Amino acid sequence: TKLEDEQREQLAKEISKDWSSVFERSINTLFLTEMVRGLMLTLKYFFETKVTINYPFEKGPLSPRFRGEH
Amino acid sequence: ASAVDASGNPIPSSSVLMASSKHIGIRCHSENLDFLKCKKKDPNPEKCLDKGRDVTRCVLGLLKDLHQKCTKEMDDYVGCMYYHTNEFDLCRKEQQAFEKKCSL
Amino acid sequence: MNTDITASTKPEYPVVDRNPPFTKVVGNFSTLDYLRFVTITGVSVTVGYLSGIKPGIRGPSMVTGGLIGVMGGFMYAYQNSAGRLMGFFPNDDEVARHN
Amino acid sequence: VRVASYFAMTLGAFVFWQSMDKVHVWIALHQDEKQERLEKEAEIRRVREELLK
Amino acid sequence: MDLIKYFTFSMIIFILGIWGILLNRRNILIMLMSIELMLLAVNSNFLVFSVSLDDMMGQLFALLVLTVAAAESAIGLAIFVITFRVRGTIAVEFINSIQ
Amino acid sequence: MFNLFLAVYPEIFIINATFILLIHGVVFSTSKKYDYPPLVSNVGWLGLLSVLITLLLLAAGAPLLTIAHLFRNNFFRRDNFTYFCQILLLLSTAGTISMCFDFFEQERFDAFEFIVLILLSTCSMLFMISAYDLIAMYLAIELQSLCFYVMAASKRKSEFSTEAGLKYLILGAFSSGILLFGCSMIYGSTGATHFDQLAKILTGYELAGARSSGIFMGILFIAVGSLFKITAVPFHMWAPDIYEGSPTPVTAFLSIAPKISIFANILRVFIYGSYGATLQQIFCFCSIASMILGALAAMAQTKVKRLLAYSSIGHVGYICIGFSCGTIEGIQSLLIGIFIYALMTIDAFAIVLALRQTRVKYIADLGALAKTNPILAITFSITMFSYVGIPPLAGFCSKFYLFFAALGCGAYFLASVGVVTSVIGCFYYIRLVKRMFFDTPRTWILYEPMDRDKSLLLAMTSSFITLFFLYPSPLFSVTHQMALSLYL
Amino acid sequence: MEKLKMFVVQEPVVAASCLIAGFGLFLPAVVRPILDSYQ
Amino acid sequence: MILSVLFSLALVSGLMVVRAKNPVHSVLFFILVFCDTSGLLLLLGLDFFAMIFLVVYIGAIAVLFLFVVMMFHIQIAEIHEEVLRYLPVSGIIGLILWWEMFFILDNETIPLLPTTSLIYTVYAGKVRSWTNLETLGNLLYTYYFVWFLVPSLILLVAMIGAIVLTMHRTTKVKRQDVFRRNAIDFRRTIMR
Amino acid sequence: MLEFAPICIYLVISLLVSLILLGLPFLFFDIRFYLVSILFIIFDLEVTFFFPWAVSLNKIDLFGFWSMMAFLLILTIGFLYEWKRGALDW
Amino acid sequence: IAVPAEILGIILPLLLGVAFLVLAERKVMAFVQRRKGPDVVGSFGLLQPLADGLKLILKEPISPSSANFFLFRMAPVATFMLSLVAWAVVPFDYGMVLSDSNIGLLYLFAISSLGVYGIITAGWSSNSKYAFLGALRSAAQMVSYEVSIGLILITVLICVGSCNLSEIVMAQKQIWFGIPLFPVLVMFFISCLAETNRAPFDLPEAEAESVAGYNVEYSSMGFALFFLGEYANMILMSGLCTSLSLGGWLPILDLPIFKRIPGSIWFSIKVILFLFLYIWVRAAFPRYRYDQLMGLGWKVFLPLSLAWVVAVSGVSVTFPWLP
Amino acid sequence: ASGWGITGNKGRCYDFWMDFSECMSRCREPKDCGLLREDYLECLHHSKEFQRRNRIYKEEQRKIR
Amino acid sequence: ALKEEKYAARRSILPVLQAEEDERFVREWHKYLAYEAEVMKDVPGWKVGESVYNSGRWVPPASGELRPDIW
């Protein structure tokens, strides 16, 4: 686990090069940027058109080489 | 919300008094202060009832004078101060109409 | 909030001021009060170093002892200075300075 | 079933509390007599003390 | 009458906690529960006395007693957990090793 | 630091030092950089240093503790009585911390939370000694009670420690409930919580009558709680079991430190506030029971810790005769007895911890000690004779001055019972001395040498005990001044 | 400084809470006396 | 009448706590008696104290007791004793305490026998009615701060004791770490 | 008070409707939980103390504010103890 | 008298709103997932809640016979009581309150505290130990996030001198408290999400996953009552969010065109946006492990809530900005 | 008794308590303040007033009988 | 400012309400004193509305009910 600890320290030093980067990372982790982006995509699909087939009146496409009833 | 008895008498009530609070405190601050001083000196109601009687006389005279000076404005003010339980913020137009007639 | 500085026992020496300010009490620190602070801090640091050898944290032990000793020595020096300035202690030198 | 037993015990506790109210009223009523008894006893002790003195 | 009824109820709760301790010989959690009932009776007495006497000391000390009772319940359940883990059971005859 | 807090520098410093020690210990014991070091010794040394520093603060700032008299009057009042009581309490705490160092390393008990709780409980006893109200009294009592719960149950896997913790838990909670009911009754029937108000209301009127029945019950319940806190026979049943079960440093601290604080609290709540002959009668009965049953039960004991517990119960009974006389000489005798008993208990428990290296359990274990460790045998025999009350040693001074206070007390029955108990209870101390010196057992239990921390303390305490009869004027004068200053 | 940056990266939420608490204690400790003197 | 019903329910719940066979039922009846005491506080007029009784006693301490009792899984005949034998001593002690209550009430607090029309209303303290919560906060935080800071030490002691008594970290169990490189930067790699 | 009678009647009506809903078809170990509960007790006491402080900030001065801050600091040290010991982890 | 009429007029529309809320959750989640929700039981599926309730009523019950029949049956009753009595205080406009308690905030906090007992007793009374363990987990999670919720309530109580929701809103008149305390509103929203076991932190609804839940043993009406209690709590805490950080029955910018709307419409609209946010977060995010969510509640939201309490108190005390 | 009333105003008879305390502080003998101590206790418990009302009620009821 | 306006309006009205309440209480207390005299005239050694307190300092009659004003 000493290797894991030193790898963690090296990575932390790598991604903490300057105050700008550390502040940006902290703000991104605190203000839920990825969550907001996922919410925006979800809202886009809420407002987009649907692909429901409306079964009894509209039926899915088939092919002449369909294996249905003997 | 009536604010008036059968024979033009002003009902003390609480809406009427709350409407005429500023007028009371401006007209007879004096014996109101005197009655409060007597109450502080001796809390017994019987020891000085005369100061309370003078305060009541002031309040009744002011209510009668205000009612006989402006009636429609005072009646509307008391009605709207009864509809909303003595909330001044909910009765602004009626209060302003009352202020114009009977100036402080 | 009301605060009263009156003490139960009357001071036995002339009172420069009943409730001296914190800055004035700190500035009243004589060489003896500085010696008190230095001795207490040094005792604490030495005790911390000598006790932290077995656990293996000599630097951390000295640091903890240093904070404890600084707090205690500053409290003792402030206590002595305030007691002198309120007349509880033999404040001959600052009584003369006030006079 | 325990709900019926719980309600029966609740009624019993209610009856006990009315009994407690009754004994409180009884104590309120029979206090003056205790007062004269205590006064008589205190008078006896005072007379005894004054005869000793 | 209201003060009489409240004081009688509080005294009855105190006696009921005493009875819980008395009857629960082989039960210890119910003994702690009876102690907590005693605490509740004390708090109720303090509150009703404050209300009757028009003094705020009863409310202050009832709040402090609530805090203390909560802390002591935390500590007591810690003791219960460690004991039950040590001997594997809560029976009283396993908690009689000292005599 | 604004100038009112001159009245609370010792407590503030001890609290801040406890917080600093807790933070340091946790952060450097949960550290993977090191090998998770046992920080108990380092934290204990720093806590002993903090205790010494706050002792110096309290001793040097003797007139400054009275600053903000009216500001602090609601919570506590400080005077010469509290000053000396707190000085003795800090000395006892420092001795207990110093003499329990070797227990840590050898017995592997490496929880610095023990030292943190030592400091926190010491602050609680400081607040208790200063306390001047029915609320601060309860708060300080409960603080030390929770600390002692955790202390007794400190050894988690130990069956004895867990059982002692559970028993002390339940019985202390019961006593807290009783004391709380007493406080509630007094508040309801008096309208007052401050000790000055209680004194003003209660003086001039006896507590035995139709009036103030609720006041009488509240005072009686508070007395019951305090008697439980001092292990009187009507409420003593916890003392031996928890004293045996809890780890030896914990039981030493329990036997030494809480006694002085609880007794100063009792003096300030009862002798000053609710002074009335019924309280002295209650404590007279409690003292009779304490002495008689302590002697009787310690005669039948065969374990060192249980014998020490019952000796503590008997000496509390003697402190209770001193209280139950309740005069100037009575209170001075109470203070003398408390000081002497604390010194003797420190001596005895230092010797016990010295013998803890080889895990001494029974009285027979220290048999043939006059050969393996001669000077230790003489030292422990001197301690046992001091507990007896043999004249040249310190215990006899407290003994005869308690008996003199009882003869000027008018309590001939109390004095006769006390002296008969003193004769009766000499037997088990003599049995200990026989076990060290007289017996020739088939096999001997060789005891490892001491640590310097216990050795210096034991030497100082034994020199004080043996040579106290050459110069008792300082202690007698100090206790007389404290008793006089209790009121004026 | 480097260790502080590493700590802020590794535990951002505790650093943010500490900064917020420091600001909350700093306003009445300094700015309140400053405003009292100014008034 | 409502007061009588409330403490009758409280007494019954307390008796069920005392004589309940199942400790879980004991906890539930303890919750019930706490609720009845809260109702009594409503009748008294201490809304804040009733709500804090609910929050602390009903919430915190009672969920603690419930958790520990259910997690123990105590069986019958492990905690079981006949109550008939202790009935005489319980009755004697309860009767002594009741007689002492009798003596206390007979002297100090005399009940009033039948009032409303004689109530003298001051009207002076009602212009700004201070709530119980408001008054308690003002007092407790201005002029009794020591008795407020001391319980903080008690809570700290309780937390320290709870940890030093009931802490057991896993000796050898893997713990997930989210600060890995593939989570942080994740440079893409291929077979070529 | 005079406002909790509607609450009591609401409770009674809720009981009635719940019983009706139930009766409609009839017509046809681990220490982590303990530690969490103890933390719950401590922070319930914290919030119980916050409520009057928060309400009466306007009356209590910087004295009261700093007393509450000292209370928190005394109890936040306990939270740091929890964090470093490992009580908050699962 | 009129009090039972008011109570019934609060309770029954609340049940209708809960039914249409589960229907709206289905519809919104389906529209998110590029499909259409219930559309075949009535026009646009408006009769779907009625059909579901009728089916649940007509389903024949089963008796587990768990030797704890009373406690098994009464736990959903307890949680239903708690949800309803919590709803007994929430205002809708100026004067639409049953109990205008001066301690309304602490009343709601206490009712939320009592809410764990229904689930705890449901888990214990069930024969299976998996249900008991799941109930314990859910209870602990609600405990932690209710501590956080109480701290947020303390922040709001620092902002507003009073403790009743109506006067809270009357203070909200100026700035809605959401503009000053948007991070506090976000933390309160996440805490109430974890309080009702909805969205992320969804342990009981992860039945297809190994955690199972406390509702496995429950019959048709027990499960229905637990679901109704959970959704009533969801609506309750949405109302709490809008009364605490969105001004309740208050328009935007106080324009006179906006004042034509009664205000109860404003409160309803804000509650609808909060419910839409509930369904949005549930549909858009994965769920946390139990240990992860517990550590997040005890290590991320509690320190932040304490820090925000301290910051708001420091801002208000330093400046004359104090009520 | 402290003057902190239950409704944020002056206590019910903190004035009586202060009269008794001043008498005790300036008195030559503690029995001099017996009347004021009786007044303070009577305010605290209403014992004498309640007894007077109870005996009035008893006389009224026995006259009816 | 709004709350201060409301409280200032309340304070100006207070003296007349207090006067009315004082007169009402005086009338009721005089009626009670007359009732007490007419029901207690038979027993000797009975005063008319004697105060159990000393040194004056009139206090309102005890109601026997805890907090009667809140209800």
Ligand SMILES: CCCCCCCCCCCCCCCCCC(=O)OC[C@H](COP(=O)([O-])OCC[N+](C)(C)C)OC(=O)CCCCCCCCCCCCCCCCC
């Ligand atoms: C107008 C008057 C009308 C009548 C009024 C009086 C009605 C009767 C009141 C007494 C109670 C009767 C029902 C008892 C049922 C007990 C069932 C049982 O065994 O439960 C097991 C439980 C133990 O729990 P358990 O777990 O064994 O539960 C099993 C329950 N069963 C049997 C139903 C399956 O026992 C107890 O809890 C002990 C109860 C003792 C009795 C308490 C009664 C209430 C308090 C009475 C106070 C005094 C009243 C009289 C005062 C007189 C004046 C001073």
